[PDB]
From Swiss-Prot, chain A:
Purpose of the protein: DNA-dependent RNA polymerase catalyzes the transcription of DNA into RNA using the four ribonucleoside triphosphates as substrates. Common component of RNA polymerases I, II and III which synthesize ribosomal RNA precursors, mRNA precursors and many functional non-coding RNAs, and a small RNAs, such as 5S rRNA and tRNAs, respectively. Pol II is the central component of the basal RNA polymerase II transcription machinery. Pols are composed of mobile elements that move relative to each other. In Pol II, RBP10 is part of the core element with the central large cleft.
Residues reported to bind Zn(2+): C7, C10, C44, C45
NCBIfam families in alphabetical order: PRK04016.1
Record-given protein name: DNA-directed RNA polymerases I, II, and III subunit RPABC5
UniProtKB/Swiss-Prot annotation, chain C:
Presence of keyword Membrane: no
Zinc finger (C4-type): 6-26
Full-length numbering of the shown residues: 19 to 63 of 63
Binding of Zn(2+), residues: C6, C9, C23, C26
Keyword Metal-binding applies: yes
One example GO MF annotation: zinc ion binding
Encoding gene, per UniProt annotation: rpc10
Keywords: DNA-directed RNA polymerase, Metal-binding, Nucleus, Transcription, Zinc, Zinc-finger
Subcellular location: Nucleus
Native species: Schizosaccharomyces pombe (strain 972 / ATCC 24843) (Fission yeast)
Physiological role: DNA-dependent RNA polymerase catalyzes the transcription of DNA into RNA using the four ribonucleoside triphosphates as substrates. Common component of RNA polymerases I, II and III which synthesize ribosomal RNA precursors, mRNA precursors and many functional non-coding RNAs, and a small RNAs, such as 5S rRNA and tRNAs, respectively.
Gene Ontology BP terms: transcription by RNA polymerase I; transcription by RNA polymerase II; transcription by RNA polymerase III; transcription elongation by RNA polymerase I
Gene Ontology cellular component list: cytosol; nucleolus; nucleus; RNA polymerase I complex; RNA polymerase II, core complex; RNA polymerase III complex
Protein name stated in the entry: DNA-directed RNA polymerases I, II, and III subunit RPABC4
Subunit structure, interactors included: Component of the RNA polymerase I (Pol I), RNA polymerase II (Pol II) and RNA polymerase III (Pol III) complexes consisting of 14, 12 and 17 subunits, respectively.
From Swiss-Prot, chain E:
Binding site for Mg(2+) 1: D23, D25, D27
Highest taxon of the lineage: Eukaryota
Chain residues that bind Mg(2+) 2: D23, D25
Family, per entry: Belongs to the RNA polymerase beta' chain family.
Protein modification: The tandem 7 residues repeats in the C-terminal domain (CTD) can be highly phosphorylated. The phosphorylation activates Pol II. Phosphorylation occurs mainly at residues 'Ser-2' and 'Ser-5' of the heptapeptide repeat. The phosphorylation state is believed to result from the balanced action of site-specific CTD kinases and phosphatase, and a 'CTD code' that specifies the position of Pol II within the transcription cycle has been proposed.
From-to range in the entire protein, with total length: 465 to 516 of 1752
Protein name in the entry: DNA-directed RNA polymerase II subunit rpb1
Role of this protein: DNA-dependent RNA polymerase catalyzes the transcription of DNA into RNA using the four ribonucleoside triphosphates as substrates. Largest and catalytic component of RNA polymerase II which synthesizes mRNA precursors and many functional non-coding RNAs. Forms the polymerase active center together with the second largest subunit. Pol II is the central component of the basal RNA polymerase II transcription machinery. It is composed of mobile elements that move relative to each other.
Domain notes: The C-terminal domain (CTD) serves as a platform for assembly of factors that regulate transcription initiation, elongation, termination and mRNA processing.
From Swiss-Prot, chain F:
Matching SMART domains: RPOLD (SM00662)
UniProt entry keywords in alphabetical sequence: DNA-directed RNA polymerase, Nucleus, Transcription
Family annotation (Pfam families): RNA_pol_A_bac, RNA_pol_L
Keyword Transcription in record: yes
Biological role: DNA-dependent RNA polymerase catalyzes the transcription of DNA into RNA using the four ribonucleoside triphosphates as substrates. Component of RNA polymerase II which synthesizes mRNA precursors and many functional non-coding RNAs. Pol II is the central component of the basal RNA polymerase II transcription machinery. It is composed of mobile elements that move relative to each other. RPB3 is part of the core element with the central large cleft and the clamp element that moves to open and close the cleft.
Domain of life per record: Eukaryota
PROSITE patterns: RNA_POL_D_30KD
Listed name of the protein: DNA-directed RNA polymerase II subunit RPB3
Cross-referenced Gene3D superfamilies: DNA-directed RNA polymerase, insert domain (2.170.120.12), RNA polymerase, RBP11-like subunit (3.30.1360.10)
InterPro entries listed in its UniProt record: DNA-dir_RNA_pol_30-40kDasu_CS, DNA-dir_RNA_pol_insert, DNA-dir_RNA_pol_RpoA/D/Rpb3, RBP11-like, RNAP_Rpo3/Rpb3/RPAC1, RNApol_insert_sf, Rpo3/RPB3_RNA_Pol_subunit
GO molecular function: DNA binding; DNA-directed RNA polymerase activity; protein dimerization activity
């Protein structure tokens, strides 16, 4: 459910860096490589936005 | 060593393999009789018999708990009663295994048929990685 | 007695002990329970 | 459930931070046990403590990665002290630290100017 | 000889793993505490990881 | 003499080079910066109503890691609060812990997206205010909502070091590399077919020797010149961390001396 915020290995904040991420791999014709434009030189955490599942859009639609 | 691993605490602190453990307690309302009632009334230490190490201090006027009350220990969550001065109220209510803890997700009170009341309680209990997990 | 909430509508059913489990301005027969007040002690770890 | 209290990692439970106690065996040599502070302070008074010709031994090692402490043995042999050898060391350190704490606060603003300003 | 660490598993000594033909695949091992001071003696003077 | 030789800087990291110093001190600085460096972070939430999808438990852990401004910190009374553990006041008081608020509701029907922006400090210019790593955004993401799912949270931060929970260290990582060729052979490279041929020279490799000869290799030589590279979270300016690194590292050496010259 939603980006982890703070990568698992370092501290590099990733809560901020997704509302902007998704607006490239599906909205700018840049590669998975495009995240490099977000200051992701380390492995590391950058496999954080990448290996992530958006499990809330598909959970939020159960309205009580 | 020998088929075993050491993990970084910094990570488990930010959420490595953090999991949740919902458990749910089912309970209906049998009625044999004749006409023997057995409501989810809050046990009254004035003519019960018998049940100690409560505490029932965590039950509402409804005899059921309200999410998300920090429940731990052998705390109790529902209350029963079965007829037989000051007589007579029994206690067929279900406690909570001490081995578990944590708060209470939500409870659902419906009707069975049967023909009485029917409650279900679910409590959540975050579980972090600790030495000895697989 | 207390208040209850339906699985669909969610409207306040505020229904009385020992009666019938259902709703009022609608249908279905289940219902959960309002969260207590209740300022609860929560560590951030 | 049996997780030691984390705050009991950064707070001496009425435990004497430092303790200085001779040995036997060895003669003119004592063993220091700093508590709730290790794996940082320790490594310094070594790869630096051994730099004083006055020294003939330099202990240092955490007994168990659960207890947050560590010992330090020093032998010398022969005139003093060795409570004085490690202090002469510590002093040589704090003062060697500023050597860089100052160069830092000096060269920082100095390469802050070349990336525009202004003022 | 017990004592006594924290965290909820039994720490034991690797060189003693061969006799228990069992790795750390999440295995369980039972502990039986003696009571009387007369058995405490048996499993000290005859049966001991050392004398075994 | 010198001691440091910086290269590039930015707003989140500080690349530079140590000079006249020993290995120990290097590492012992790496460590310091990654652990015991006072910071603010939230370490207690009280929930009132929460009918969202993130459980209370799950919010606490998440609301925690979100960085906050710290700046000075070690400079009371104001513009800096001392650990809430050893405080002159009782239980919890604004004199040693900064209060935070979160009253998020729903006025839409599409979808909500509550960021770190919506929180509210108090107005005591501590701070205080979290951060906004994002470019002209509003901060790190907290939770999503649909229909009526208002949550009401009371957050208060304390003071703590990485040691106590990775939540505090305002420091991402560090990137050192003393002896980039292989002077002191502090390492045995695995071949596999030809040594100096499989392993990549490092960007920081172009600042030294000793290729050619066959001297043969030296040994009176100790490791000096360390190519570090500190990166902060964005909680507190990019050193900061370093500066405040030794300030509470000298004072950690002192503790010692004073406990040996008094008696
Ligand atoms: Mg096998
Ligand atoms: Zn990372
Ligand atoms: Zn309804
Ligand atoms: Zn206070």
């Amino acid at each position: 459910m939603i980006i982890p915020i703070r990568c698992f290995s370092c501290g590099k904040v990733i809560g901020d860096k997704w509302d902007t991420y998704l607006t490239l791999l599906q909205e700018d014709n840049t590669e998975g490589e495009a995240l490099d434009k977000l200051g992701l030189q380390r492995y590391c955490c950058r496999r954080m936005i990448l290996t992530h599942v958006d499990l809330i859009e598909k959970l939020l639609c159960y309205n009580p | 060593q020998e088929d075993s691993i050491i993990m970084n605490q910094a990570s488990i602190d930010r959420g490595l393999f953090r999991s949740i453990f919902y458990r749910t307690y089912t309970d209906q309302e049998k009625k044999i009789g004749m006409t023997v009632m057995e409501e989810f009334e809050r046990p009254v230490r004035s003519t019960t018999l018998r049940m100690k190490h409560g505490t029932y201090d965590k039950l509402e006027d409804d005899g059921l708990i309200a999410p998300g009350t920090r429940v731990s220990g052998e705390d109790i969550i529902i209350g029963k009663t079965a007829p037989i001065q000051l007589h007579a109220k029994r206690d067929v209510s279900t406690p909570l295994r001490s081995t578990e803890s944590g708060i209470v997700d939500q409870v659902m009170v419906t009707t069975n048929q049967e023909g009485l009341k029917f409650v279900k309680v679910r409590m959540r209990s975050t579980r972090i990685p600790q030495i000895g997990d697989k | 007695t207390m208040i209850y909430l339906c699985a669909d509508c969610g409207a306040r059913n505020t229904i009385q002990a020992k009666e019938v489990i259902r709703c009022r301005e609608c249908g279905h027969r289940v219902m959960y329970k309002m969260r207590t007040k209740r300022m609860v002690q929560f560590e951030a770890r | 459930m049996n997780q030691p209290e984390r705050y009991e990692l950064i707070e001496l439970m009425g435990l004497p931070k430092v303790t200085y106690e001779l040995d036997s065996k060895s003669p003119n040599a004592a063993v220091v046990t700093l508590e709730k502070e290790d794996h940082t302070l320790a490594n310094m008074l070594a790869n630096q403590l051994l730099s004083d010709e006055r020294v003939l031994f330099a202990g240092y090692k955490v007994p168990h990665p659960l207890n947050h402490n560590f010992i330090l043995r020093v032998q010398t042999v022969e005139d003093c002290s060795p409570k004085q050898v490690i202090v002469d060391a510590a002093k040589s350190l704090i003062t060697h630290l500023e050597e860089i704490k100052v160069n830092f606060m000096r060269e920082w603003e100095l390469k802050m100017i070349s990336v525009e300003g202004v003022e | 000889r017990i004592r006594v660490m924290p965290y909820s598993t039994f720490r034991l000594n690797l060189s003693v793993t061969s006799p228990y033909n069992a790795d750390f695949d999440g295995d369980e091992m039972n502990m039986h505490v003696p009571q009387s001071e007369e058995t405490r003696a048996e499993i000290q003077e005859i049966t001991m990881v050392p004398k075994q | 003499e010198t001691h440091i030789t910086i290269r590039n800087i930015s707003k989140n990291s500080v690349d530079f080079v140590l000079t006249n110093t020993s290995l120990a001190v290097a590492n012992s600085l790496r460590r310091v910066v990654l652990a015991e460096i006072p910071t603010v972070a939230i370490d207690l939430v009280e929930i009132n109503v929460n009918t969202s999808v993130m459980p209370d438990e799950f919010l606490a852990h998440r609301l925690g890691m979100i960085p906050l401004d710290s700046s000075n910190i070690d400079e009371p009374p104001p513009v800096g609060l001392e650990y809430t553990r050893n405080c002159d006041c009782d239980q919890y008081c604004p004199k040693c812990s900064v209060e935070l608020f979160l009253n998020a509701k729903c006025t839409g029907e599409g979808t909500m997206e509550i960021y770190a922006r919506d929180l509210v400090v108090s107005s005591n210019s501590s701070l205080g205010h979290p951060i906004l790593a994002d470019p002209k955004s509003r901060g790190p993401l907290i939770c999503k909502l649909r229909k009526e799912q208002e949550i009401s949270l009371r957050c208060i931060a304390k003071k703590g070091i990485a040691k106590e929970h990775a939540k505090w260290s305002p420091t991402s990582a560090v990137a050192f590399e003393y002896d980039p060729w292989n002077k002191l052979q502090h390492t045995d490279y695995w071949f596999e077919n030809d040594a100096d041929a499989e392993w990549p020279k490092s960007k920081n490799a172009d600042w030294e020797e000793p290729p050619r000869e066959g001297e043969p290799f030296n040994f009176q030589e100790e490791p000096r010149r360390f190519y570090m590279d500190v990166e902060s979270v964005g909680s507190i300016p990019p050193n900061e961390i370093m500066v405040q690194g030794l300030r509470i590292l000298q004072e950690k050496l002192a503790v010692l001396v004073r406990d040996l010259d008094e008696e």
